[PDB]
Design an enzyme around this catalytic site. Structure first.
Site, PDB file in Angstrom:
ATOM      1  N   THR A   1     -17.661 -35.318  38.732  1.00 41.83           N
ATOM      2  CA  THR A   1     -17.113 -36.059  39.903  1.00 41.83           C
ATOM      3  C   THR A   1     -18.278 -36.575  40.754  1.00 41.83           C
ATOM      4  OG1 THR A   1     -15.019 -34.885  39.924  1.00 41.83           O
ATOM      5  CG2 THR A   1     -15.710 -35.847  42.016  1.00 41.83           C
ATOM      6  N   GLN A   2     -18.219 -37.847  41.149  1.00 36.62           N
ATOM      7  CA  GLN A   2     -19.271 -38.527  41.946  1.00 36.62           C
ATOM      8  C   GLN A   2     -18.614 -39.577  42.847  1.00 36.62           C
ATOM      9  OE1 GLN A   2     -21.216 -41.742  39.450  1.00 36.62           O
ATOM     10  NE2 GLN A   2     -21.167 -40.103  37.927  1.00 36.62           N
TER      11      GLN A   2
ATOM     12  N   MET B   1     -15.012 -35.194  33.283  1.00 32.44           N
ATOM     13  CA  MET B   1     -14.870 -35.343  34.760  1.00 32.44           C
ATOM     14  C   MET B   1     -16.214 -35.740  35.380  1.00 32.44           C
ATOM     15  SD  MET B   1     -11.710 -34.794  35.444  1.00 32.44           S
ATOM     16  CE  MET B   1     -11.670 -34.534  37.218  1.00 32.44           C
TER      17      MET B   1
ATOM     18  N   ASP C   1     -25.699 -35.839  42.063  1.00 31.39           N
ATOM     19  CA  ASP C   1     -24.578 -35.056  42.653  1.00 31.39           C
ATOM     20  C   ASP C   1     -25.122 -34.086  43.710  1.00 31.39           C
ATOM     21  OD1 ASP C   1     -22.833 -36.393  40.941  1.00 31.39           O
ATOM     22  OD2 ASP C   1     -22.066 -34.572  39.955  1.00 31.39           O
TER      23      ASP C   1
ATOM     24  N   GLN D   1     -12.285 -38.132  45.779  1.00 30.57           N
ATOM     25  CA  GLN D   1     -12.507 -37.353  44.520  1.00 30.57           C
ATOM     26  C   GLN D   1     -12.035 -38.206  43.336  1.00 30.57           C
ATOM     27  OE1 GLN D   1     -10.728 -34.257  42.354  1.00 30.57           O
ATOM     28  NE2 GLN D   1     -12.709 -34.771  41.449  1.00 30.57           N
TER      29      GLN D   1
END
Ligand SMILES: [Cl-]
Ligand SMILES: [Cl-]
Ligand SMILES: [Mg+2]
Lengths: 222, 204, 125, 233, 211, 195, 221, 195, 195, 195
Positions: D1-2, D107, J90, A1
């Site tokens: 987030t990635q 983020m 994603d 993360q």
């Protein structure tokens, strides 16, 4: 993360005299066990005889100093070029920091200048904007190494008057700028020896009624 | 649940001109609660002084263990153990418990009775030897003690002067640690006399 | 939403929609307030052109805002209900936050503030 | 987030007396060190700036477009777009630095380490770094990833401090960069033999070198190494 | 360690001055009493920033009430502004332990405990912080309603000193306040370093330490 | 916030609520009233998460007081309980639900009958001759099952409550510092001064 | 930062002298160069207790082996005994060693990882400063180095670690093992990190510290 | 990247020279071809530590076998490798190719993958993290190839693996096992890259 | 097992131990004696994990009683405390450690001096004028710091204990059902019948 | 396994026909070659659902582009694929090869791997879990190959992938994009296995 925070190391030191104040910082920028730069200033003249440093995560530090410098600019525009007093600057920075209470700026902030009576002032902040006026404050990586030394050599803590059976304390007095710079230089050479993130260079900004002067001193590069 | 910072406390050792000094705080706590203000962390086996910081059960256990080992040493060798040799015995004894260690930060101080050379050494919990000319620090305020020592210390201090320097190093370090203080003891160690002084310090 | 400025200034410096609102009040049944040494009395007129009225259930002219404050009015009956409701809600809201019932001056200042807001808000008379 | 998928390895750079040098190998790397070659990681912006990018290739191509988009925008209603009001390295960096920090603060970072190498209008050498956290710093030598660990130590032997920059020639600086690239090829599993090098000189302008190869490699000694200790044959 | 108790002579408020980051002692000179207005005091426990920011904000909200209502705000109303504010933020991770102390003619001397869980309690005695148990031990044992002002001030001071000694996360100095109808009065900053030894010598207490 | 009891007798409803407020290792207060008067003939006791309890109680109090003024009429205990249940039943699928349990004791002036309602934080309403929330019912339900009668007087109901409180003071690990007792009858709401 | 470099008539090992606990420098001048046998020396990185303990145990067993066989010990013996010990403990003994020496077979240079893998090389480097050290070795190493060239290359590779790696610093320790000569151990070969004069002397006036009690300690029988 | 190929005169073993910790090449001139007997060799893949520990033990077992029973078969060497790999499969991560030359059996190739199973094949190739490939251009491999053919076949195969795989790289080492004896071959990048 | 206190006065040691045993939500017993006589002039109070406490106490009792018979001599309080510490210090690195805290109060007949030892489950021994285990020390240490004197009588020591118990009964969340008090002096061990 | 190869007359697109849930082949005659425009086609790898959703949107965008601006470039089609893949990286797991024929630009091949990056290549091959191979026998590929050569090159390449990879299998489908038009080729296992 993804982790949005980092540690760029470095350590900063503010000391308030009678008619002057100093804000010192090492010029080393690090990530983990690598040196990013041997000269990257993190102590800034913000105008109105206020010097500022936000030590910790450099990105959050640069962001905060940028925002405060902008806050000084817009204070002039909105209040007829009125000088921003150090106490007013401090309260403004509390709001900037507490603004991001739930996504904090990961830095320790120290501002130095003169109060409205022309006497030396140092204010220190936590990441979320709790602040306090102090004669003496070290911040960052090597704060734990420098701060007790300053308690002893600036505030004369645990020092008593010889022959008085430890009944009469060593009397408090203001130090000259020459004597303060000696304590700063020794504080940083000491921290350089025992802290891997501290070294390369020491930049001191001195604030008097005459303005903001700079002094640079080499530190060990290991 | 970090054994090395449940009870708290600090030890510092320094070398001077034909003398050594070792000092410790007197606090034993259970985390936030202060329990005892009379818990000395410095023991002596003949003329060799050992300070121990960390988990207090292990401090007591290691004192009892080194008393045992040095008593048998003296009976077999027919002479008191020297600092250099005792250092090796501490190192041996800690590394024996490599995968179940004693949560301690021991410090050796003393003068070699033959050569008259001042000697200090520090160890990690698994017995790595830090031999140093200048000073050794241990405990919950080690960072603080490193700062004080590295700035205050100079070489070849006389006993009376060295006392002031180590005292000020300990007192100012303890006052910036929540789990250290509640009184302090300083041993000044010359070749053939040892003075033990209790320091007056803030009780918070 | 409907944005139109209905309450605006005229060349002579009058706001006609506010002044025409006073005409609606002048048309309303008479209401009188007399305060004594240790009491206040609220008298109200009921026009007698309405017989076969059920006085039990018919909306009364004097409204309790709290247990200690009352509101009477002259003008549009339907409009009065909106001010009384807002006032009753503000009375309970004051007790909840200040842990004290409203003063009469405060309750008045609130109702007057609502009436004022409707004189320089778009889309409302 | 990635999570980064296809990535570029180290970008290395240094200042010399009359400008800056920047270099980067032409490889994209997959998950378990799988290779791909034919990726240009040096973006020339105008004729005074080169932007070297490491990290996610997809995010690199997005930044490539932002810079192409920036040059177009600067030209709009600008008679001095090719003169006094031309894009500067300092401007291009600050834009990228601003983007990187606001992306981390949302983020949703651009998974890259960027070095902006160029010469300013007054002839001052510009060299500054920014990464996915929005962290920025300047130094006479700058490198990303493995380059920070292996290239910097070599480049700092040539220019250890600011006072060494005037004494360093383009011939010396280029040799130092080209040598550093060979060391990265020896020791980085995600490096390639093929690389690009760019020189921005205040006197001679921007020189862009493509399809360069690591040469004068030492492998001969390998024949003499047998087993892992006791094996004689 | 903070406390406030009600007695014949009004309210006593006593606090320590220590801030810690883990086992690091960050400060010994923190002001844990917010002045607010001349008849209103706020104590601070928990997060330094949370307390300092929101109790300074409370002082602004109290000033606005007095401009609008042309009357000083009641301790009840002032405490409920702060308790209603923290309740909005509940679960966000605000950390505050607080006491709103003041006199007004209609209420008399009043103490309200307010915390970041949203608890609001009216009471005669409160101790808040890591060292509250140590303070409670001394206060409850020697507390009388008909204490003299001089004795009450000392008991407050003594109760903080007790907690400063035993609690690792309490210490520095003792800050003393007395609240009456006339308003609050500062009774000075007493360094625990000097105070401890004076109290030991004069009281004959603290037998546990080297003597 | 731990012990709340309720007994419905012939002509009244009795609510008993523990006086202790405990934060961490310390008992902050020993005189806490865990009840709000909703209307002159309707009382609500509450227990649960700190802050949420008082915030919920006062919010309900304000809404019922508002209805009373608007209609110049006292809402029936059944109507108040139904309103309170619906507020909790909304809460449970909120971003941050109210963690509050309540007893509602009321005298219905139309039916001339006492009524006791037990509602949990989920909005689970039930009408009972006697009720409790949390671990309280673990001891008291067996005792009430034995001694309770529908035709009991208020004095009989208070004696049966003393027996419940004595059992709790014997077998419960926490010191809840005794109970405040309140009776709800045709004449309204009064507090038993000594218990 | 530790290195090994092979030259014509022997092998040279070098190391930095910094010990670190987290970001704190625990020791500014610790010895990372270990004597297994008179002409077999070891450079150690990782856990400091582990490198010393594993170096002394194998050194002890090598001495007993030398006495039993009546022969100068071999580097391959030290290597085999170290790797088999480290493998047994599956990496839990955190010792990363550069093993060099001269014996009747000739000069040898080996590296050992904590899990028990060994490598053969003409130049090696281990520790946090290995990448900084390896950059110098990869840039300047050539076949048929002289002793003077090998010492210079080894010390330069350590210097690269001292300056550029935060895990390394202070002085440079060298040990030269030449065939047909006594191994020479150059402790603090370079000292490029000398603390500058302090601005002020912090020597206190006597009586500055408050004292509660004094007592004479009896250390005699 | 490792492989072993049987041909007319015997068997050839080929491997790369790269050792990696993450993306750092710890050793760029690694010898992955290890002697367990004069004409029994193995290709090592997986953990360097594990494969070295196993190879050292196997060498010991074959030295002791030779002392008592004379020269052991390639099958016997493969069996000893399997035994260690199968019985300690829980603690071990080692993929091994065993190639040997008997005057009776000529060239033989055995593969011990991560399972601890044994397989006898004409040739074997394992790439990446001990990944054995079925076929790998079986139309490129014939039985009874010449040495020159077999060297070219391995050189091409390993060069393609190094091209696409970052764990493989450096020089290509080979060991030729025939009646004639043992020959060591090395191919530097400049030769094998241009294929 | 919660509250154990100890005060060493001029001529005696006083141990106070809570009477409550709580399992789950119920108080099983209100008359539990959390002490064992180790020898005629040495008493040990204990608190901690259920079972472990009594098992440890009785084990120590048996070992001291065995020493007393073997040597026809009473072991000193210092000697007993050192023995007990070593047993706990062994326990902490056992498969399943004893989770027991103890106070040891004894009168040394050789020194004619009362002695109080506090030992936690880790084997952390300390000699004190007054001691406690768990949360009890949070309230009592401040009170004792204020009122305690070294030259106090037994009556003075019992009054100072009443002040500690009153503070605990006020500010502690659990009902510990009062304390059993035992005095250890030159004449041996007696229990204060009413407290 | 999917690949696209540029040749003299245009470009050929090749793919397998196997769709798997775990080890179960959900569809053994899958059409992985999808039309986004008359002479712009794509090879789909990764999630079937994701690649279908993306391909349907791209087809919509090119149909609307054609209405307004006329026939779009292969570069334009690749850009639209990238945009969807990059911006939704994603939530998406889709590896796509875009091949198209212009009369100006002739055959072009673009690859959009998992990153969401775009790459223009002479040919491209993705095998296993959307894994793109550098080179894949670059000495087997030449510029300006004949159709018959290009079909043989793809047939051989994909057959080797199916040999070694269980996710690939069934029939080999190909689509030939030239000025002449669109040709569909199919090769059954019995033909392509014996290679
Ligand atoms: Cl290997
Ligand atoms: Cl499909
Ligand atoms: Mg370094």
């Amino acid at each position: 993360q993804f982790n949005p925070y980092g540690d760029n190391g470095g350590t900063i030191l503010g000391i308030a005299g009678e008619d002057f104040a100093v804000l010192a910082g090492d010029t080393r920028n690090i990530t983990d066990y690598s040196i990013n730069s041997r000269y990257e200033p993190k102590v800034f003249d913000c105008g109105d005889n206020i010097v500022m440093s936000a030590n910790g995560f450099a990105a959050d530090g640069d962001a905060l100093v940028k925002r405060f410098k902008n806050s000084v600019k817009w204070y002039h525009f909105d209040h007829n070029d009125k000088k921003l007093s150090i106490n007013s600057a401090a309260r403004n920075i509390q709001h900037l920091l507490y603004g991001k209470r739930f996504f904090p700026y990961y830095v320790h902030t120290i501002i130095a200048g003169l109060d409205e009576d022309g006497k030396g002032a140092v204010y220190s902040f936590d990441p979320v904007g709790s602040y306090e006026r102090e004669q003496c404050r070290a911040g960052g990586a090597a704060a734990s190494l420098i701060m007790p030394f300053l308690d002893n050599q600036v505030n004369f803590k645990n020092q008593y008057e010889p022959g008085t059976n430890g009944k009469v304390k060593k009397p408090l007095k203001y130090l000259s700028v020459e004597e303060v710079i000696k304590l700063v230089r020794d504080s940083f050479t000491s921290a350089t020896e025992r802290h891997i993130q501290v070294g390369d260079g020491l930049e001191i900004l001195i604030v008097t009624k005459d303005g903001v002067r700079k002094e640079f001193y080499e530190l060990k590069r290991d | 649940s970090d054994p090395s910072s449940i009870n708290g406390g600090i030890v510092v050792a320094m070398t001077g001109k034909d003398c050594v000094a070792i000092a410790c705080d007197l606090r034993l706590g259970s985390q936030s609660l202060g329990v005892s203000n009379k818990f000395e962390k410095i023991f002596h086996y003949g003329h060799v002084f050992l300070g121990i910081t960390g988990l207090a059960t292990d401090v007591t256990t290691l004192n009892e263990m080194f008393r045992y080992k040095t008593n048998l040493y003296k009976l077999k060798e027919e002479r008191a153990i020297e600092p250099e040799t005792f250092t090796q015995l501490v190192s041996s004894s800690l590394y024996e418990r490599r995968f179940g260690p004693y949560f301690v930060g021991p410090v050796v101080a003393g003068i070699n009775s033959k050569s008259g050379k001042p000697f200090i050494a520090g160890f990690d919990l698994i017995g790595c030897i830090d031999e140093a000319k200048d000073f050794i620090v241990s405990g919950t305020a080690s960072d603080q003690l490193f700062g004080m020592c590295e700035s205050l210390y100079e070489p070849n201090l006389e006993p009376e002067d060295l006392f002031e320097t180590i005292s000020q190093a300990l007192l100012n370090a303890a006052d910036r640690d929540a789990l250290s203080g509640w009184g302090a003891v300083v041993y000044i160690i010359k070749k053939d006399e040892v003075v033990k002084r209790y320091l007056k310090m803030r009780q918070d | 939403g409907y944005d139109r400025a209905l309450s605006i200034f005229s060349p002579d410096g009058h706001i006609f929609q506010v002044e025409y609102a006073l005409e609606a009040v002048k048309r309303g049944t008479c209401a009188v307030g007399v305060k004594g040494k240790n009491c206040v009395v609220l008298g109200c007129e009921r026009r007698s052109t309405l017989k076969l009225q059920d006085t039990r259930i018919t909306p009364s002219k004097v409204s309790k805002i709290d247990s200690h404050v009352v509101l009477s009015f002259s003008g549009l009956n339907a409009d009065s209900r909106i001010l009384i409701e807002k006032a009753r809600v503000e009375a309970q809201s004051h007790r909840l936050t200040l842990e004290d019932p409203v003063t009469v001056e405060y309750l008045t200042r609130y109702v007057a503030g609502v009436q004022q807001r409707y004189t320089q808000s778009g889309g409302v008379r | 987030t990635q999570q980064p998928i296809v990535t570029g390895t180290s970008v290395i750079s240094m200042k010399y007396d009359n400008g800056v040098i920047i270099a980067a190998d032409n490889l994209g790397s997959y998950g378990s060190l799988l290779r791909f070659n034919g990726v240009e990681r040096l973006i020339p912006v105008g004729d005074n700036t080169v932007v070297g990018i490491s990290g996610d290739i997809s995010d690199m191509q997005h930044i490539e477009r932002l810079l192409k988009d920036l040059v177009t925008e600067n030209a709009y209603d600008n008679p001095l777009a090719d003169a006094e009001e031309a894009l500067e390295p300092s401007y291009i960096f600050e834009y990228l630095a601003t983007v990187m920090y606001q992306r981390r603060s949302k983020m949703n970072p651009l998974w890259n380490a960027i070095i902006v190498a160029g010469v300013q209008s007054n002839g001052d050498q510009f060299l500054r770094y920014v990464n996915l956290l929005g962290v920025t710093y300047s130094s006479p030598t700058l490198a990303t990833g493995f380059g920070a660990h292996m290239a910097n130590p070599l480049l700092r032997k040539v220019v250890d401090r600011e006072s060494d920059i005037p004494k360093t020639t383009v011939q010396v600086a280029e040799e130092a960069i080209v040598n550093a690239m060979r060391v990265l090829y020896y020791r980085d599993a995600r490096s390639s033999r093929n690389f690009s090098l760019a020189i921005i000189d205040k006197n001679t302008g921007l020189t862009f070198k493509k399809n360069l190869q690591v040469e004068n490699m030492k492998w001969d000694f390998a024949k003499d190494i047998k087993g892992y200790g006791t094996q004689k044959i | 360690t903070t406390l406030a108790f009600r007695f014949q002579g009004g309210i006593i408020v006593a606090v320590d001055s220590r801030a810690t980051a883990g086992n690091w002692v960050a400060s010994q000179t923190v002001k844990k009493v917010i002045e607010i207005n001349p008849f209103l005091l706020g104590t601070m426990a928990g997060g330094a920033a949370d307390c300092q920011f929101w109790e300074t904000w409370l002082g602004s909200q109290c000033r606005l009430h007095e401009l609008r209502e042309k009357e000083r705000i009641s301790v009840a109303a002032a405490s409920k502004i702060l308790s209603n504010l923290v309740y909005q933020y509940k679960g966000a991770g605000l950390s505050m332990g607080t006491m709103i102390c003041g006199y007004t003619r209609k209420e008399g001397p009043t103490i309200y405990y307010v915390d970041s869980d949203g608890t609001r309690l009216k009471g005669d005695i409160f101790c808040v912080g890591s060292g509250q148990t140590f303070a409670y031990g001394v206060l409850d044992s020697n507390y009388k309603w008909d204490l003299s002002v001089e004795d009450a001030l000392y008991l407050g001071k003594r109760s903080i000193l007790a907690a400063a000694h035993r609690d690792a996360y309490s210490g520095g100095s003792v800050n003393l306040y007395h609240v009456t109808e006339d308003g609050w009065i500062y009774h000075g900053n007493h360094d625990v370093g000097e105070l401890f030894w004076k109290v030991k010598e004069e009281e004959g207490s603290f037998n546990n330490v080297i003597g | 916030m731990d012990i709340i009891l309720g007994i419905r007798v012939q002509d009244s409803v009795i609510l008993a609520s523990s006086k202790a407020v405990t934060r961490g290792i310390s008992v902050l207060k020993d005189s806490d009233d865990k009840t709000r008067q909703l209307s002159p003939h309707t009382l609500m006791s509450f227990a649960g998460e700190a802050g949420d309890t008082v915030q919920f109680a006062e919010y309900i109090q304000a809404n019922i007081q508002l209805y009373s003024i608007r209609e110049d009429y006292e809402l029936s205990p059944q109507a108040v309980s139904s309103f309170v249940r619906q507020e909790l039943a909304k809460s449970i699928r909120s971003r941050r639900p109210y963690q509050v349990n309540v007893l509602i004791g009321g005298y219905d002036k139309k039916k001339n009958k006492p009524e006791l309602y037990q509602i949990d934080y989920l909005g689970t309403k039930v009408e009972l001759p006697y009720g409790a929330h949390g671990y309280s019912g673990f001891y008291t339900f067996s005792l009430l099952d034995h001694h309770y009668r529908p035709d009991m007087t208020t004095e009989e109901g208070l004696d049966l409550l003393k027996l419940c409180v004595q059992e709790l003071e014997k077998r419960m690990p926490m010191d809840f510092k005794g109970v405040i007792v309140k009776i709800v009858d045709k004449d309204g709401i009064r507090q038993v001064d000594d218990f | 930062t530790i290195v090994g470099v092979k030259f014509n008539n022997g092998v040279v090992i070098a190391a930095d002298t910094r010990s670190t606990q987290g970001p704190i420098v625990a020791d500014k001048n610790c010895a990372k160069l270990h004597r297994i046998s008179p002409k077999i020396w070891c450079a150690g990185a990782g856990t400091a207790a582990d490198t010393e303990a594993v170096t002394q145990l194998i050194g002890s067993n090598i001495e007993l082996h030398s006495l039993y066989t009546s022969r100068e010990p071999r580097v391959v013996s030290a290597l085999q005994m170290l790797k088999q010990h480290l493998f047994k403990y599956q990496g839990h003994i955190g010792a990363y060693l550069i093993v060099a020496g001269v014996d009747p077979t000739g000069s040898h240079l080996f590296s050992i990882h904590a899990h028990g893998s060994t490598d053969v090389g003409y130049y090696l480097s281990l520790g946090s400063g290995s990448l900084a050290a390896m950059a110098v070795l990869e840039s300047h190493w050539k076949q048929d180095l002289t002793k003077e060239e090998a010492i210079k290359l080894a010390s330069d590779a350590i210097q690269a670690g001292i300056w550029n790696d935060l895990g390394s610093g202070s002085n440079v320790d060298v040990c030269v093992m030449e065939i047909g000569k006594d191994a020479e151990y150059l402790r603090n070969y370079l000292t490029p990190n000398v603390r500058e004069e302090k601005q002020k002397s912090y020597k206190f006036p006597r009586g500055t510290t408050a004292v509660l009690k004094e007592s004479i300690v009896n250390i005699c029988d | 990247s490792i492989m072993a190929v049987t041909f007319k005169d015997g068997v050839i073993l080929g491997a790369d020279s790269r050792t990696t910790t993450g993306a750092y090449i710890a050793n760029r001139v690694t010898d992955k071809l290890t002697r367990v007997h004069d004409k029994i060799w193995c290709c090592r893949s997986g953990s360097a530590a594990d494969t070295q520990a196993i190879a050292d033990i196997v060498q010991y077992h074959l030295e002791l076998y030779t002392s008592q029973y004379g020269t052991p078969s390639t099958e016997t060497a493969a069996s000893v490798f399997k035994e260690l790999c199968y019985e300690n499969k829980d603690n071990l991560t080692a993929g091994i190719i065993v190639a040997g030359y008997d005057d009776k059996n000529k060239g033989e190739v055995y593969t011990i993958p991560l399972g601890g199973s044994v397989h006898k094949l004409p040739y074997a190739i394992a790439v990446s993290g001990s990944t054995f490939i079925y076929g790998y251009c079986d139309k490129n491999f014939r039985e009874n190839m010449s040495k020159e053919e077999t060297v070219d076949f391995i050189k091409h195969s390993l060069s393609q693996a190094i091209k696409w795989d970052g764990s493989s790289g450096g020089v290509i080492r080979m060991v030729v096992l025939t009646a004639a004896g043992v020959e060591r071959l090395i191919f530097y990048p400049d030769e094998y890259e241009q294929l």
